[PDB]
Amino acid sequence: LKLPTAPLQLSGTSAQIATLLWQVAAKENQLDKVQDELYQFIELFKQHSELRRLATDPFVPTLVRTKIISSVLKDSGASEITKKLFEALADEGALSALLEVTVNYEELMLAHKKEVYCTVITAEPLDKLERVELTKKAEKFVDAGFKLVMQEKIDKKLLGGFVIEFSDRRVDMSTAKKVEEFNNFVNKLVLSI
Amino acid sequence: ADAKALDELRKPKFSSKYLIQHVSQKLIPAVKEWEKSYQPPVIHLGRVLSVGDGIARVYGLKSVQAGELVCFDSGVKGMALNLQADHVGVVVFGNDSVIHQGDLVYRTGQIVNVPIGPGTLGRVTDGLGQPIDGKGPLTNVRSSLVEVKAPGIIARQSVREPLFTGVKAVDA
Amino acid sequence: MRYTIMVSATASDAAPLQFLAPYSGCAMAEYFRDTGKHGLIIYDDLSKQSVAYRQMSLLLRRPPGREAFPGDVFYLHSRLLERAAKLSKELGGGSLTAFPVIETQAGDVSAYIATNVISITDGQIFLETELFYKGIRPALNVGLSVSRVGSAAQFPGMKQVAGTLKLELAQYREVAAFAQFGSDLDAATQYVLERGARLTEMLKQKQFAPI
Amino acid sequence: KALDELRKPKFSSKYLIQHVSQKLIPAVK
Amino acid sequence: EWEKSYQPPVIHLGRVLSVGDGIARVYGLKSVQAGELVCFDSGVKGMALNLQADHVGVVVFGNDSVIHQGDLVYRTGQIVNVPIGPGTLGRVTDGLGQPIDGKGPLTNVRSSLVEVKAPGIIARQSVREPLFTGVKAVDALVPIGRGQRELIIGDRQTGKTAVAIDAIIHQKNCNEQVPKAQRVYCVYVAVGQKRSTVAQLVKLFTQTGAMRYTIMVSATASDAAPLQFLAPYSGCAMAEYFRDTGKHGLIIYDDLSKQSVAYRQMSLLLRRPPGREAFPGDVFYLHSRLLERAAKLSKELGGGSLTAFPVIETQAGDVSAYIATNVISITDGQIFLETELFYKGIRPALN
Amino acid sequence: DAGYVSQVIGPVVDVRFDGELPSILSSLEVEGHSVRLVLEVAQHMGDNTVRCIAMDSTDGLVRGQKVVDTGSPIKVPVGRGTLGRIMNVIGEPVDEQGPIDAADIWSIHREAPEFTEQSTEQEILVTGIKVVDLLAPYQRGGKIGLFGGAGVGKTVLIMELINNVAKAHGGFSVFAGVGERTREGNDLYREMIESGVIKLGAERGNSKCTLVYGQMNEPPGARARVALTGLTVAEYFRDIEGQDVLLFVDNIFRFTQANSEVSALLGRIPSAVGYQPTLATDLGGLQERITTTTKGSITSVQAVYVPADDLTDPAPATTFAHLDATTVLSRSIAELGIYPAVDPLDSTSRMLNPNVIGAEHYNVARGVQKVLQDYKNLQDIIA
Amino acid sequence: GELPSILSSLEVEGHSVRLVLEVAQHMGDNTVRCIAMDSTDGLVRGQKVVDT
Ligand SMILES: Nc1ncnc2c1ncn2[C@@H]1O[C@H](COP(=O)(O)OP(=O)(O)OP(=O)(O)O)[C@@H](O)[C@H]1O
Ligand SMILES: Nc1ncnc2c1ncn2[C@@H]1O[C@H](COP(=O)(O)OP(=O)(O)O)[C@@H](O)[C@H]1O
Ligand SMILES: [Mg+2]
């Protein structure tokens, strides 16, 4: 009667599908099994046209929607957690709800691994010492014993330094911001003096 | 949960394909066992999702404009007043009882035109050009834009002509 | 009927055939303006055309406003009554003169359709149900009815004598409600009552009698 | 290209999560 | 010593989904507070009023044509505050706390939170000593005590600003011959007036000499919606400074109906549920916490006072309109200033 | 780079974009239309979509048609050659004399002039109407309002005020037609060519007026921004040239109505009685741009149609705070046959004070107010 | 199978009264919109509905 606890809460009626999906698959310990199975359906929704007609056509009746999905979903290695899921979305026309339920299941899976994104922008590419001096200030800016990925990036307008685009937080140690804030502390003291 | 995560979802990261080889083999016999339950994919035509009381909501119709006369499959004429994201709200000229969920909607392309001219002097039509006076169709007439904007400032002059009404309560 | 076209949207027809019928009604009469002639147009029951506009939008999931009429209903009656005009010399010199008909809701001049169409149109003719039973037929209100262009818009011989007609009617509407005392003093408070009452008994006529 | 119509959720039945939950727990062994 | 104190901020983020009409709906901000003052990228501030499940609604203190979709908002971690203190005297600030006079910054000031609770029961002492406002029709007929609420209701073009400013000039005509403690300081808060009318009002407080005592908070009609919403709270937060220092203060809100037009304009833009005359339901609460902030503190907690003079502009004398129904209910009385008897020579037309 | 129209609902159309969405209050263009169509963005939908307002009629927009970005607000051509020209909202000639002989296009959407550059010196603007110059004396460089019903005589005061003050000034003026009839638009074009304010030929550069016309036929995109198009060319002649320019705007109420006709259509709940929720920043942003600064002078003349002589509607009840001198027209005084039908009680200006004009002007106008208030309080009992 | 034309009747089965329906709007989902001409107390969401 107990479900495995969701690592972070979400919004409703389109993303808590993924919260419920994570609460089912982690009970079956099928976590990285079914997550890239959602990816294949997106490639099925990308390349093939007959399946992606079924996710947006408003004229197909409510029995051809389920009798193609359960016809396509034989065993084939596919999980019955996944097979009972994709039956349910074509049961109530929710086959358009796939591209949202994945990216929050992506978020919830990266919430199960303690594994946060970032994107660091410099003016200079990072060598094998410059990148390993970066993380020791970056891991002051995560809250706990988390992981860290790297998405190194080049832009000329920053004059050295970095900006850690956590997508939730940002730390500006770039000098182009520093010379801007140096100029604002010039003007706030030359006008007052 | 943003659009860059959606564009990252456009990059495939599946790491295995142990379904796609077989679901591409059972796709085509599935759609051709249930082939009779498929209406054809309709792009430059239209087909009715919802219909009622003079406002009929029509899927598709990538080619229409605002204010294009459309023709339903029973001969009923229509008008596209607003065009939503996935559907086009179509206003229905006349009684609407003949339109079902799944009937065809034909674009006529033009802006709505009612016949003008001096051959109409003596005829009683409705607002659509069809005669109700029982004297047959309109002869020596032509169509014109009913959605035309007014004549501009440079086009007008000062009024002079009094327009007698024949009524002393008015003209004095 | 030789010189009359009539577009006739009934109440048993759908809404947009009534919504388009003044629009198609001015599409005929722009031809008479374009080719130099003069055109008469009467947009009869123009409030009921606006109710024919209100039916379509409120089924069309569009936001309502004053009296559940939509937002742009001023723009409906605007371009319905701006395409009637008097062109310059350079396009034949044709004309169009406009008669919209707005029924008040038993005396709401601040009714939502009324405040639009009283501000668009140039002159108005009030017909109360009060004046229709005092013998005044047609029951024009004189003190409330204005025009724009004034002179060179009447008969010019009538135009000189109209100032003798309007201003004596102006004092008479002020003294008609002062009949609660029995005054008739100094041969003026009786004579302007004696004049304007015969002016009312002058200015009645018969239905369907073009003189 | 072929995923612009899939970019957002769209459905009827605002209580959809309760519908799918009875169709996800059956395959729970 | 500024370079030696530069620790970079960790400051948390939020990205904007939809932004329009001075209302920006932001995504993210896992810890923003209710009514927290945020800052955008392009130097314009903002407050988040409502906080929903997925997106957070943020109202904008300024022009809104600078923010695209996908811009960033930084949380300042502080509920919106205004610089209070004596250095504001003579200055003409905007309602957020910045000066618009052209006299540089506001020095000898301190920032304090504009949103606190009113004084309770035991803070109060019964108002006994009187405030004197110069207009003899106010002072003798419908009198006003030091630490009291009195509504200058009226029509427009009828003198509601005149009953306000002639009280202010009377204080300058009274403060020069009264000792240091019981000197009544003016904060006439201009809501919804023109940017040129305040120019006449900054002139009359200088030419008479009252600008030694007046702080002119003028959120115009030309700035955005929440500045006209926040100008009475910040102006009463300026009146908070003169309360707990123990002095006596005069706070005047002018045309508080426009502040109701301010709280209407953001509420229907934020899709809060509308109530009577399409105002939000809680607009009576946002009028009361304003007007219950000015009072007389007792002889154990400071001894100072605070008397508030709100102004409601009616339409033709309807004292039962919904906005006037609220303010008459929370305030004590009414100085009804009718337009029709104003031309009957009784100046002010005090019915 | 560029995007497509994705959705059409009457006079508001929706444009989607593939990255780098346009800034708010910028200009958009559709190709393959009958006339050049300008879309002015008012809010972002959220899914890479701006929501617009249409300067001309949308009847003809296909779903998916090519929409380019000008990346910038609406640009009208300002200049000295613009005198003697009948101008649109989007910079067009609609008097059919070539292009506009001017340069240095300017953004017609800006911020208001600040609090520091405000003028407090007041000069009595003597007009020539005996009820104006005695009772409600106008201010040079100040604001002139005109209320009154539809059929009381507002617009015939305005052209009378042009003949009073806009001829005997010598400099420049601007007639900003916001949603009035073409009849009072076309007639004013003839009675300024004959009065010589607007000239034709090779003397186009010595004229005194530009006409910015957003009359009733246009959809409410054009009727909502012709107020700003007429405003910014007046604010161009103020700051660059220094001359005093008279802004004759007609039907400010039609500016606020043109906003309110689509304000519900952009996804906003209606305000009080059915007018727009954002009327305060719409009109208050309009009015305080019309001021007089240290650099020059703008003397605004505002006509407002009020519906059925009721001043309780909030669309003119925001305007009463925004007008120094107000000439309130009563239909009753016109029903008495008195022209001008200017109220002795409702129409009151800000110059009326003995501390500015002199006691000889203030006492008789107050003496007018005593004898006319008691005449109203006695003409009830005279019956 | 196929949704009937507008303003056509329906005949429900299994009710205590011979209850008739009249279709007026085709509300999508292969589902129509009706107004019941008699008492609606006792309709279960599976009852067979036939048309004339
Ligand atoms: N004692 C007085 N004698 C003569 N005029 C007065 C007097 N008091 C006020 N006024 C008039 O009041 C007008 C404006 O004053 P004030 O701004 O106080 O009125 P108001 O009711 O605030 O108007 P609004 O609400 O439109 O701003 C001035 O034109 C002034 O002539
Ligand atoms: N001083 C005047 N002399 C002559 N006619 C006048 C005068 N004042 C007003 N009128 C009349 O008032 C009428 C309405 O004028 P107008 O300004 O068009 O009203 P509105 O602004 O309400 O449309 C005009 O027809 C005009 O003849
Ligand atoms: Mg005032």
Side-chain angles (χ1 to χ4, degrees):
Chain A
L1 59 92
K2 43 189 167 184
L3 276 65
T5 62
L8 54 86
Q9 310 92 298
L10 281 182
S11 170
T13 64
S14 164
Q16 71 175 324
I17 325 178
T19 299
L20 180 87
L21 195 65
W22 198 88
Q23 284 162 316
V24 169
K27 186 43 75 186
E28 290 268 12
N29 297 118
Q30 266 177 291
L31 288 176
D32 217 307
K33 169 164 206 317
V34 294
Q35 187 189 19
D36 68 314
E37 284 296 321
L38 301 155
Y39 291 162
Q40 299 189 16
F41 283 99
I42 305 150
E43 190 188 0
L44 263 167
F45 274 126
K46 177 185 188 52
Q47 293 175 7
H48 297 260
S49 194
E50 191 52 58
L51 178 61
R52 72 178 165 83
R53 192 199 178 171
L54 291 162
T56 178
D57 198 43
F59 285 132
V60 291
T62 184
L63 204 44
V64 74
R65 211 179 266 103
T66 174
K67 262 305 172 182
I68 295 316
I69 293 312
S70 187
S71 162
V72 160
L73 296 184
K74 306 312 281 188
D75 205 318
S76 171
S79 158
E80 296 193 13
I81 297 298
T82 303
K83 280 152 60 75
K84 287 282 190 179
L85 182 60
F86 279 96
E87 183 78 285
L89 302 191
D91 206 51
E92 288 206 339
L95 289 189
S96 78
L98 196 56
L99 293 202
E100 206 279 333
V101 72
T102 46
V103 291
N104 276 310
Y105 196 68
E106 281 196 341
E107 159 67 38
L108 276 183
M109 181 39 55
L110 295 176
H112 171 66
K113 286 206 177 120
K114 298 62 155 114
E115 300 207 335
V116 64
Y117 278 113
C118 75
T119 296
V120 179
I121 302 182
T122 61
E124 312 152 314
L126 302 200
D127 305 286
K128 50 185 291 293
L129 182 55
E130 183 162 83
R131 204 176 290 104
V132 309
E133 86 170 7
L134 174 74
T135 65
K136 273 74 183 171
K137 289 182 286 185
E139 295 191 346
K140 308 288 178 306
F141 295 144
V142 291
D143 66 318
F146 279 22
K147 265 82 171 154
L148 180 61
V149 310
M150 204 44 60
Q151 209 203 335
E152 65 274 60
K153 203 173 258 192
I154 292 295
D155 172 83
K156 258 59 195 174
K157 289 204 65 46
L158 278 71
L159 280 89
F162 41 83
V163 276
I164 320 289
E165 292 267 35
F166 268 2
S167 55
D168 174 279
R169 285 183 272 259
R170 153 194 287 248
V171 174
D172 202 317
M173 302 195 29
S174 165
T175 58
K177 188 254 180 189
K178 189 159 166 54
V179 301
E180 199 275 340
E181 289 292 325
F182 175 75
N183 287 303
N184 291 117
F185 203 51
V186 162
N187 297 151
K188 200 187 287 184
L189 285 178
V190 59
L191 298 183
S192 63
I193 201 80
Chain B
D2 78 316
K4 301 308 143 188
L6 186 137
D7 210 5
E8 185 261 3
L9 212 49
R10 205 172 174 262
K11 294 171 176 41
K13 301 150 299 272
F14 43 84
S15 71
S16 165
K17 339 163 171 48
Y18 67 100
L19 277 75
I20 311 168
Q21 45 162 8
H22 183 87
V23 305
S24 308
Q25 214 275 344
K26 259 171 192 170
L27 178 85
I28 304 108
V31 74
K32 295 198 64 184
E33 280 195 289
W34 296 90
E35 195 270 334
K36 64 203 174 319
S37 193
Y38 269 81
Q39 295 188 291
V42 162
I43 293 302
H44 280 137
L45 264 283
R47 194 179 307 258
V48 164
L49 311 169
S50 157
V51 50
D53 317 318
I55 298 296
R57 198 170 70 247
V58 174
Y59 158 77
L61 266 185
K62 213 190 160 309
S63 44
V64 284
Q65 295 171 352
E68 263 192 8
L69 204 154
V70 298
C71 169
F72 301 93
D73 50 352
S74 157
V76 197
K77 307 197 167 74
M79 180 182 187
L81 185 48
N82 45 6
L83 288 84
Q84 304 293 327
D86 202 12
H87 56 247
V88 170
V90 176
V91 197
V92 168
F93 294 118
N95 187 20
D96 70 318
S97 89
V98 70
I99 301 305
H100 308 88
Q101 181 208 56
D103 275 323
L104 277 169
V105 192
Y106 281 72
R107 159 185 204 244
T108 80
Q110 64 156 339
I111 310 285
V112 287
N113 274 36
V114 182
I116 78 160
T120 39
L121 286 169
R123 309 299 312 276
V124 173
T125 45
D126 52 350
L128 200 59
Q130 277 66 26
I132 69 164
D133 53 352
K135 291 185 288 294
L138 309 173
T139 310
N140 291 349
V141 291
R142 80 164 181 85
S143 86
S144 159
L145 169 61
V146 308
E147 293 289 329
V148 55
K149 72 181 288 185
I153 296 190
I154 201 68
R156 307 168 167 250
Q157 77 189 359
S158 159
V159 304
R160 297 291 91 191
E161 296 296 302
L163 184 82
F164 304 105
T165 56
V167 181
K168 48 177 190 300
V170 187
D171 298 298
Chain C
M1 194 62 208
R2 179 156 82 263
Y3 297 150
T4 305
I5 308 165
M6 179 166 179
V7 46
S8 49
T10 182
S12 165
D13 210 284
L17 257 184
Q18 311 159 58
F19 162 71
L20 210 55
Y23 270 78
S24 56
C26 209
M28 322 285 110
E30 283 181 351
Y31 159 70
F32 294 89
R33 199 184 83 242
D34 181 277
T35 60
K37 272 77 67 178
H38 300 78
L40 189 65
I41 185 78
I42 296 100
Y43 303 87
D44 195 12
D45 288 296
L46 202 63
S47 195
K48 286 180 198 127
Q49 188 263 329
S50 190
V51 186
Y53 178 52
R54 200 197 53 194
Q55 180 190 335
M56 297 168 318
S57 71
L58 257 51
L59 289 149
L60 264 166
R61 309 296 261 162
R62 277 188 169 203
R66 288 276 300 269
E67 277 309 320
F69 280 68
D72 65 326
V73 75
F74 170 61
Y75 171 63
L76 180 141
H77 280 143
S78 305
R79 78 178 206 268
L80 185 57
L81 289 181
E82 266 320 293
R83 58 182 67 186
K86 176 62 165 188
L87 312 161
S88 306
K89 274 188 164 306
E90 277 86 3
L91 202 60
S95 81
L96 280 179
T97 170
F99 285 121
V101 178
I102 296 303
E103 64 275 17
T104 44
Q105 286 286 123
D108 305 355
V109 69
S110 195
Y112 181 46
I113 300 304
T115 69
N116 297 325
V117 191
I118 67 153
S119 202
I120 300 175
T121 61
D122 322 336
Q124 317 95 344
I125 295 166
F126 293 87
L127 311 177
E128 293 100 335
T129 192
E130 305 267 346
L131 300 175
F132 185 70
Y133 294 87
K134 297 205 295 167
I136 309 183
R137 273 81 49 81
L140 178 144
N141 193 302
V142 188
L144 299 174
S145 78
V146 70
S147 166
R148 284 309 181 280
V149 202
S151 159
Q154 283 168 323
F155 198 88
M158 176 74 73
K159 186 258 290 182
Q160 166 70 267
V161 73
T164 62
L165 205 79
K166 182 71 59 189
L167 205 50
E168 191 47 76
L169 265 157
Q171 328 291 333
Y172 166 66
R173 295 185 298 273
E174 191 41 65
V175 302
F178 213 72
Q180 62 181 272
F181 297 130
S183 62
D184 61 278
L185 179 86
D186 63 90
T189 59
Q190 56 86 11
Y191 177 67
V192 306
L193 168 61
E194 181 66 31
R195 178 68 84 83
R198 299 199 318 276
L199 278 189
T200 53
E201 303 294 326
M202 168 60 70
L203 291 179
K204 308 159 176 211
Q205 68 153 87
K206 186 209 158 277
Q207 204 169 353
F208 304 141
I211 317 173
Chain D
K1 296 300 172 181
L3 74 159
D4 277 351
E5 311 96 20
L6 284 168
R7 292 184 84 262
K8 64 177 172 310
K10 57 174 71 175
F11 38 78
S12 87
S13 158
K14 306 193 172 303
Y15 312 115
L16 190 85
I17 179 64
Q18 288 84 18
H19 180 91
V20 178
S21 48
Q22 313 183 358
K23 304 286 284 290
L24 270 189
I25 70 180
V28 170
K29 183 219 299 174
Chain E
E1 80 160 49
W2 175 81
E3 198 183 13
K4 87 187 292 185
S5 174
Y6 189 80
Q7 190 78 258
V10 206
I11 40 171
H12 315 263
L13 257 296
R15 203 194 297 240
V16 287
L17 312 176
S18 86
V19 52
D21 309 328
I23 286 300
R25 291 170 178 98
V26 313
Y27 165 68
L29 284 171
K30 76 185 175 76
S31 87
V32 71
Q33 317 170 203
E36 204 277 332
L37 162 81
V38 306
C39 170
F40 287 73
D41 299 306
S42 317
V44 52
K45 291 290 178 184
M47 182 168 57
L49 285 168
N50 57 341
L51 291 75
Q52 311 176 6
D54 53 356
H55 76 95
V56 188
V58 171
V59 68
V60 163
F61 305 99
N63 190 3
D64 203 76
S65 166
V66 310
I67 298 292
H68 305 92
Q69 163 182 330
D71 295 332
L72 293 197
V73 291
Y74 306 104
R75 44 177 314 272
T76 62
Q78 42 184 37
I79 318 293
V80 57
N81 51 347
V82 60
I84 74 172
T88 42
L89 285 158
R91 307 300 273 267
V92 185
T93 68
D94 48 46
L96 200 52
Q98 283 90 327
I100 61 176
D101 43 0
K103 302 187 182 187
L106 319 168
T107 318
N108 312 64
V109 305
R110 182 188 55 93
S111 190
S112 163
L113 300 188
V114 314
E115 285 261 20
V116 298
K117 215 199 173 69
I121 288 298
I122 316 293
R124 299 303 169 86
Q125 184 193 350
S126 48
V127 169
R128 304 302 177 190
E129 66 178 3
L131 184 63
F132 317 106
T133 44
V135 175
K136 51 193 175 294
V138 184
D139 266 10
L141 306 164
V142 280
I144 169 71
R146 260 155 179 165
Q148 209 184 313
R149 278 78 55 89
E150 190 58 48
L151 172 68
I152 313 292
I153 205 177
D155 200 42
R156 87 287 172 276
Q157 284 156 331
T158 187
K160 311 169 307 304
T161 318
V163 178
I165 62 177
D166 194 79
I168 301 160
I169 303 159
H170 184 60
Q171 309 333 311
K172 189 263 299 180
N173 290 21
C174 190
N175 265 12
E176 313 303 341
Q177 279 93 346
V178 161
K180 203 199 308 167
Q182 35 175 332
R183 275 165 182 165
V184 284
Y185 278 82
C186 164
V187 277
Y188 171 88
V189 169
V191 187
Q193 314 179 28
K194 306 191 230 190
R195 209 169 263 189
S196 62
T197 299
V198 56
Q200 306 273 2
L201 281 172
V202 74
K203 200 168 160 197
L204 279 190
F205 298 151
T206 33
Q207 186 268 329
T208 57
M211 272 309 190
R212 208 188 143 178
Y213 295 142
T214 58
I215 305 166
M216 179 65 167
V217 180
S218 84
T220 66
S222 57
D223 49 353
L227 285 174
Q228 332 184 2
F229 165 67
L230 209 49
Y233 303 129
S234 61
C236 194
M238 296 307 302
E240 280 171 356
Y241 188 83
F242 297 148
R243 175 174 66 205
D244 63 83
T245 52
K247 294 196 305 308
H248 295 290
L250 172 82
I251 167 68
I252 301 183
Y253 322 117
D254 165 82
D255 199 67
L256 187 63
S257 71
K258 198 51 188 310
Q259 193 266 334
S260 183
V261 179
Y263 200 49
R264 186 175 74 196
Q265 182 190 3
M266 303 166 303
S267 182
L268 305 173
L269 272 173
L270 279 163
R271 292 177 206 249
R272 283 170 158 184
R276 174 157 150 200
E277 296 180 21
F279 297 94
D282 63 326
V283 73
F284 176 79
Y285 160 69
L286 274 301
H287 274 173
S288 160
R289 198 193 68 256
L290 171 70
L291 270 171
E292 288 290 327
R293 194 101 62 77
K296 170 92 155 65
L297 292 195
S298 167
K299 275 176 296 176
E300 308 90 295
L301 276 300
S305 66
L306 212 53
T307 171
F309 264 106
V311 169
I312 301 299
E313 185 256 8
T314 51
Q315 315 306 126
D318 179 41
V319 306
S320 173
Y322 172 65
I323 306 306
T325 307
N326 291 3
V327 193
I328 291 170
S329 311
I330 48 184
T331 57
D332 314 336
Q334 164 182 36
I335 302 185
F336 182 72
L337 180 43
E338 59 272 15
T339 180
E340 292 203 349
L341 305 193
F342 181 73
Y343 317 115
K344 193 50 206 270
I346 175 58
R347 262 168 294 273
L350 194 142
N351 218 32
Chain F
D1 181 86
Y4 39 83
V5 282
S6 199
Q7 188 171 216
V8 177
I9 313 99
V12 41
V13 293
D14 304 288
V15 191
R16 201 173 167 91
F17 264 80
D18 42 272
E20 200 82 16
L21 266 164
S23 297
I24 318 184
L25 311 159
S26 65
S27 302
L28 277 70
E29 295 286 330
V30 64
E31 282 74 17
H33 214 66
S34 46
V35 68
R36 47 173 292 165
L37 213 164
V38 172
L39 287 316
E40 173 174 357
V41 300
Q43 59 187 46
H44 291 188
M45 265 195 85
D47 45 27
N48 283 74
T49 310
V50 292
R51 189 180 285 278
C52 299
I53 190 165
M55 287 305 168
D56 62 77
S57 88
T58 73
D59 277 313
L61 284 194
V62 204
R63 282 188 304 151
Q65 197 169 5
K66 187 70 174 187
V67 181
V68 307
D69 199 350
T70 72
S72 63
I74 299 184
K75 308 288 187 168
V76 74
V78 304
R80 291 295 190 86
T82 68
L83 298 174
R85 302 290 295 261
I86 297 190
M87 306 195 53
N88 205 335
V89 188
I90 56 175
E92 275 181 343
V94 292
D95 57 353
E96 288 163 17
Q97 302 192 21
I100 302 174
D101 42 357
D104 316 288
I105 63 171
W106 268 50
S107 87
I108 75 171
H109 283 46
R110 68 185 65 249
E111 68 272 16
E114 277 80 17
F115 172 63
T116 80
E117 43 183 8
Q118 294 292 331
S119 49
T120 169
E121 283 286 291
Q122 290 195 324
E123 303 82 0
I124 292 96
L125 186 73
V126 168
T127 77
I129 316 299
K130 41 195 61 63
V131 63
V132 178
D133 56 0
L134 163 79
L135 256 176
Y138 296 166
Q139 173 180 330
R140 297 205 102 185
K143 301 180 186 68
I144 292 96
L146 175 45
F147 289 113
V152 187
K154 304 176 300 288
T155 309
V156 299
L157 176 50
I158 286 299
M159 181 52 212
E160 179 72 10
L161 197 46
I162 280 178
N163 202 359
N164 284 20
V165 189
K167 178 55 213 163
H169 184 274
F172 320 119
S173 190
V174 45
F175 193 79
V178 185
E180 63 265 56
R181 305 159 200 86
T182 37
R183 166 213 83 89
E184 62 197 56
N186 163 52
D187 283 331
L188 189 140
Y189 190 38
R190 292 309 144 186
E191 68 208 322
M192 262 162 55
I193 201 171
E194 274 289 335
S195 190
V197 186
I198 286 188
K199 310 206 168 303
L200 269 52
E203 44 199 348
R204 322 290 316 278
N206 57 34
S207 279
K208 289 189 55 197
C209 275
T210 170
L211 317 184
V212 189
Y213 262 101
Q215 47 82 26
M216 281 170 167
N217 177 62
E218 274 69 23
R223 282 187 276 104
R225 288 300 176 262
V226 59
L228 278 304
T229 305
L231 190 47
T232 181
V233 303
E235 294 201 88
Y236 165 69
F237 290 155
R238 168 168 74 166
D239 51 5
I240 307 301
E241 314 283 343
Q243 210 67 230
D244 181 28
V245 175
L246 284 79
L247 171 64
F248 288 96
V249 61
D250 196 356
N251 298 112
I252 290 281
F253 192 87
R254 284 320 179 216
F255 155 74
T256 320
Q257 201 197 14
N259 294 139
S260 75
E261 288 141 38
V262 305
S263 159
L265 277 149
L266 306 184
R268 312 173 194 149
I269 300 96
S271 177
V273 71
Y275 283 88
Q276 56 172 351
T278 182
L279 85 164
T281 314
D282 281 332
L283 186 46
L286 180 66
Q287 292 289 324
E288 303 306 308
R289 267 173 52 159
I290 328 166
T291 59
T292 282
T293 182
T294 308
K295 182 61 174 63
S297 315
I298 295 195
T299 318
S300 56
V301 192
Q302 288 184 32
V304 171
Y305 148 76
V306 71
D309 217 343
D310 290 328
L311 296 173
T312 194
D313 195 286
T318 320
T319 315
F320 266 123
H322 287 46
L323 291 165
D324 302 322
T326 317
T327 305
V328 179
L329 260 46
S330 316
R331 208 192 305 233
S332 277
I333 321 289
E335 279 165 58
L336 271 53
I338 314 181
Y339 285 145
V342 175
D343 208 279
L345 307 173
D346 213 321
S347 69
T348 316
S349 173
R350 290 308 203 85
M351 300 297 305
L352 211 67
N353 214 7
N355 286 167
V356 278
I357 320 186
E360 59 94 16
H361 205 156
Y362 158 79
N363 282 264
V364 55
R366 281 299 173 183
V368 156
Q369 281 184 355
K370 312 304 178 282
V371 66
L372 282 172
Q373 176 53 53
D374 275 326
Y375 196 53
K376 284 292 171 202
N377 283 141
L378 190 145
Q379 278 198 299
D380 293 272
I381 85 166
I382 203 168
Chain G
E2 184 40 66
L3 282 70
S5 288
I6 315 183
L7 308 176
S8 299
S9 158
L10 298 175
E11 294 284 327
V12 74
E13 308 286 342
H15 199 28
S16 174
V17 190
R18 183 221 168 181
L19 205 180
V20 51
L21 306 175
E22 168 184 329
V23 290
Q25 315 182 1
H26 297 189
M27 288 296 252
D29 217 347
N30 281 246
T31 304
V32 282
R33 189 49 72 107
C34 275
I35 47 171
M37 306 292 167
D38 288 80
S39 177
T40 72
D41 302 329
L43 279 192
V44 187
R45 285 158 291 178
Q47 306 202 5
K48 190 187 178 197
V49 173
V50 301
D51 48 314
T52 71

